[PDB]
Amino acid sequence: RFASVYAWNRKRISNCVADYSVLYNFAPFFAFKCYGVSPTKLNDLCFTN
Amino acid sequence: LSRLDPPEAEVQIDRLITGRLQSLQTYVTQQLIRAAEIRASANLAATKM
Numbered sequence: 001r002f003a004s005v006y007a008w009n010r011k012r013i014s015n016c017v018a019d020y021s022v023l024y025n026f027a028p029f030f031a032f033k034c035y036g037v038s039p040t041k042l043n044d045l046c047f048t049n
Numbered sequence: 050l051s052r053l054d055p056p057e058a059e060v061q062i063d064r065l066i067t068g069r070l071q072s073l074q075t076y077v078t079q080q081l082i083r084a085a086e087i088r089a090s091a092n093l094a095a096t097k098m
Contacts, residue, residue, distance in 0.1 A: 038054045045052065
């Protein structure tokens with residue numbers, strides 16, 4: 001159950017190793033626009049939040 | 050660089066290159082104008098010598 005648009009969730013992601021290769025096993029994704037980063041280089045960067 | 054694609058990191062780097070290249074043009078132009086002033090002073094000092 002995704003929440004409706006006026007009251008959206010906000011999951012804060014704490015400490016992990018983040019394999020983004022997953023998230024590539026869900027569908028065709030009508031979209032997928034990475035803005036500040038380029039999506040081919042996500043598995044080699046550190047983020048804070 | 051380690052955050053964008055060969056065709057997307059080209060515009061952002063070109064902006065920085067232009068900015069810092071302008072910095073060098075400002076620097077060198079002022080050194081030429083200021084070197085003419087110390088040269089005129091060295092000519093006066095040689096003449097007094």
